[PDB]
Design a protein around this ligand. Structure first.
Ligand SMILES: CC(C)(COP(=O)(O)OP(=O)(O)OC[C@H]1O[C@@H](n2cnc3c(N)ncnc32)[C@H](O)[C@@H]1OP(=O)(O)O)[C@@H](O)C(=O)NCCC(=O)NCCS
Ligand SMILES: CC(C)(COP(=O)(O)OP(=O)(O)OC[C@H]1O[C@@H](n2cnc3c(N)ncnc32)[C@H](O)[C@@H]1OP(=O)(O)O)[C@@H](O)C(=O)NCCC(=O)NCCS
Ligand SMILES: CC(C)(COP(=O)(O)OP(=O)(O)OC[C@H]1O[C@@H](n2cnc3c(N)ncnc32)[C@H](O)[C@@H]1OP(=O)(O)O)[C@@H](O)C(=O)NCCC(=O)NCCS
Ligand SMILES: CC(C)(COP(=O)(O)O)[C@@H](O)C(=O)NCCC(=O)NCCS
Ligand SMILES: CC(C)(COP(=O)(O)O)[C@@H](O)C(=O)NCCC(=O)NCCS
Ligand SMILES: CC(C)(COP(=O)(O)O)[C@@H](O)C(=O)NCCC(=O)NCCS
Lengths: 158, 157, 158, 157, 157, 158
């Protein structure tokens, strides 16, 4: 019954994202891991690559459905009949930004309830942004990524 | 799916009602659990707070109000809850919530903390603020359930 | 006597800005709503459009004067003989950024006193930035904008 | 244009003087209002705090020091104030200020809260910090008006 | 190079051990200084806290545990320390630390405050949190040195 | 014995940076003021200029060594045998960002200990970013810069 959506750019998907989506699947019947098709800034990985990586990294998770979407997240959520909006809150999260976002999304689709989940301490201080930047500059980020993502990232930067 | 929404609720305000209502639309059963919290010298006794919360949530079918004095995590496990509801206001209280969340996770890893956001209308209120205003005879009718406002007025009369 | 300046990019002006400038006109004799001519990033609306929209949205406000300015805000403030600097503080404001800004502006023009006003709860969680982005991506933002701004925004995005 | 600058001022520090001075350059009349705040067990009695503040602001012509024990908003309305002055330090206290501001706005919508920023010199001080240092005989001369420093030394002698 | 790591340490936790260990790898000698802090009504007496800290840091060769009741800055000067160690958790406590740091700098400008960051494992714990959990018989073995856990259990038995 | 590294873009070096590096030299034997060679966004001053300005501004400081570096800071730190990483924490610092950074750097090089120092109240509210922007827009920033930097900045903007 309960359909939740966990949207983001997932460029690329990290262990932190896997942590959050796993917790979400434990409390909700169906979870749609929604990948933004055209983010403001050109992503490192194409939508096709991001969807493929996300699908493989969540293949073990039954009620998780990876899908790409363009335009407004809220519009996609409504057409997908989602009533729960999953947001991951790391310890280094811009909380005020999350409040802005949740209130705008509530204005757009009040039937979509924002719920914030907390990752393990292990992934509470890292972001996809930092991971990409360290990787681009010759730093080891293997620890923060699913094996399939790690391999794809090495190919991408080579 | 059973969730527990713990707190001091001294007293339960419209903000708490907002959060628990959102919780009921998301989970099958919601246990509003009131901690004795003797160290906080609550204005209302646990018995009074439970009664107030019960009446204030009488219209919510899947809400159960209970009081407890033990470790919240043990009470949660004993109530068969797997979701722990917390409300996050327009304040940077987020820091304290993470400490509590991680401690509870250490005590009961299967109890998943979930944070809900209240409406803009109740984003700046707290039981403490309402009590302070009422102690100085200010009008707090707007922030409390009718039965709770009556109880607060009488308590300070 | 008391001349205040309420500067910004106002791209476009929103109900939150109207809320703040209205509160300012209630405590100060004359309020100059100053619109930055050339913001770092290309604005959605041209200075001409932004000034026109702001003028119409504040026409009902007597002691409000809409004016465009280039270069340093402090230099404009000084030449305009303003002694009060209005800053709106939303609940989702980057407070540390506001402190940086106020201290720099104080260094530049100590005779200009920064004063922070708080908008109603209704407009405390939205920014012009979020509004534009939601609008650009097919979301309903009518609620946050004066009617004239709403009409101009639809034309702009069409 | 009458403004009210409320607070516990226990004791009034150079930081408070900085804020009230900025207020006087902006508004015609400023009422520095000291709350009894019995629940905070102030170091100085309300009478002492008023006297200290009076002397400390004697040089400021448009400042009036008064004490009060009622609801701040009612006192403000009764003082004919339409501006409520609050100081914001280099701390994220901003959150608490919004709660207070919105409650006061609910109690008296025409009382407009305005936040002023102190100089860098006083951006990290508080009455609480000064008292803690003085309780351990540390030199706090730099942070307090001459009359206040004298009173604090004598109070702890 | 002598550093002082002051605190209430009521009780010293694995988080404190993490911070003091990082300090010893950076400076020649580290003085773990425990403040009497009577105003905080500590669970353990200063004597008990010193003993607990001593045992908990026995393996750290360049750490010296001492208690004090005077102004921290004077104690630091009297201990010949020129570095003041403070731990910063995953919380926005940073604000309070700046106030303390600037006051101590005013009292003793040559005492340089330095902030260290604990491991992720101890980034959300505090003495207060551990005591609260233990008061409700929750398992806090994971967060405390063996000797400290024993003392806490006995203290609450 | 103790070798510390104080990395940044220093574009340009300011009195706030001088404050922090001076405090660092007082507690550590040798301090390497490391200047990032190619920051994401094109710096105002070239690496050559930034190194020259930094060297002159710290010439009076004995145990300070100004050096440029490219790629990962952690990789440079390791090859330079640094065991202490100096970070300046202003009152207007994005603390959560600093935590993200310190944990990533710890992951990369655990033997490098992050230490945060606090500048004087005088430089606690200003950033290189704000200084450059005010200067670019005709504002007086002489107060925040060493004399040599001030002169170079005027030439740069002329
Ligand atoms: C689509 C969506 C779910 C994607 O989520 P996302 O990957 O987290 O995207 P974000 O842009 O927020 O990036 C995340 C991080 O970027 C940073 N960030 C992004 N915009 C920021 C801003 N304006 N200020 C500060 N930080 C910002 C933050 O650090 C943030 O993480 P945090 O809150 O935990 O600290 C989210 O953008 C959304 O719900 N957008 C609303 C409007 C919309 O529908 N998108 C446009 C349609 S194409
Ligand atoms: C001119 C001025 C009044 C315009 O105000 P403005 O529209 O609010 O412009 P800002 O760039 O601050 O944009 C506002 C929001 O952008 C964001 N922002 C801008 N720069 C940011 C930064 N460096 N870090 C984080 N957020 C930033 C913040 O979220 C901010 O809002 P908030 O503090 O409430 O959370 C202001 O820029 C100013 O006083 N500038 C000082 C220097 C100057 O004179 N301008 C240059 C002359 S051309
Ligand atoms: C190299 C390094 C030491 C330079 O330091 P730096 O000059 O301070 O660079 P930053 O990008 O952090 O710029 C500083 C300010 O920019 C702002 N900033 C930068 N990235 C930001 C982000 N993602 N979100 C918000 N603010 C950000 C912050 O305000 C910050 O200051 P603050 O924390 O006190 O408030 C630092 O970038 C580092 O340690 N990077 C890790 C990865 C690396 O090795 N660099 C890539 C190799 S080329
Ligand atoms: C009551 C509460 C949920 C805090 O909520 P509050 O801030 O709404 O009063 C918390 O103090 C609690 O869980 N108390 C029970 C005792 C306990 O288990 N404490 C450890 C919590 S980690
Ligand atoms: C005194 C003060 C302004 C707080 O200021 P303080 O932090 O400087 O002590 C506030 O506690 C107050 O207004 N007290 C009077 C009683 C009251 O009306 N309280 C409700 C405030 S919303
Ligand atoms: C003990 C401590 C370092 C605070 O640490 P804590 O938060 O770990 O208890 C501080 O309260 C202190 O320095 N106490 C001694 C008395 C004193 O000098 N106070 C003024 C500090 S500026």
């Amino acid at each position: 019954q309960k359909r939740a959506i966990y949207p983001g750019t997932f460029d690329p998907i990290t262990n932190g994202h896997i942590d959050i989506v796993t917790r979400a699947t434990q409390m909700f019947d169906h979870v749609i891991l929604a990948i933004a098709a055209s983010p403001s800034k050109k992503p490192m990985f194409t939508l096709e690559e991001r969807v493929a990586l996300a699908q493989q990294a969540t293949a073990h998770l039954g009620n998780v459905e990876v899908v790409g979407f363009s335009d407004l997240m809220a519009n996609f959520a409504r057409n997908q009949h989602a009533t729960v909006l999953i947001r991951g809150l790391r310890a280094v999260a811009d909380f005020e930004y999350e409040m802005q976002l949740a209130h705008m999304n509530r204005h757009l689709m009040p039937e979509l309830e924002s719920v914030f989940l907390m990752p393990s301490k292990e992934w509470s201080f890292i972001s996809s942004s930092l991971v990409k930047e360290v990787a681009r500059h010759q730093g080891d980020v293997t620890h923060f990524l699913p094996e399939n993502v790690h391999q794809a990232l090495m190919a991408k930067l080579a």
